[PDB]
Amino acid sequence: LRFGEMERDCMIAHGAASFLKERLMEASDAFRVHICGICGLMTVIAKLNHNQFECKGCDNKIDIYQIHIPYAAKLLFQELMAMNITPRLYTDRSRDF
Partner DNA sequence: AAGT
Partner DNA sequence: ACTTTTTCCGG
Give the whole-angstrom CA distance, residue 46 versus residue 61: 10
- Phi, then psi, of 5 in degrees rounded to 5: -50, -50
Kindly state whether residue 6 participates in binding DNA, applying the rule CB under 7 A.
yes
CB of 93 to Zn ion, least distance (A): 19
Enter the DSSP assignment of 47.
Answer: B
Consult the annotation and say whether 10 binds a ligand: no
Nearer of residues 4 and 15 to DNA, judged by Cβ: 4
HSE of 22, CA atoms in CB hemisphere, 13 A = 5
Query: Helix (H, G, I), strand (E, B), or coil: what is residue 92?
Result: coil
- The contact pattern for Zn ion, residues 53-82, with x = CB under 5 A and - = no contact, is --x--x------------------------
Kindly state whether residue 2 participates in binding DNA, applying the rule CB under 7 A.
yes
From the annotation, which residues make up the binding site for Zn(2+)?
36, 39, 55, 58
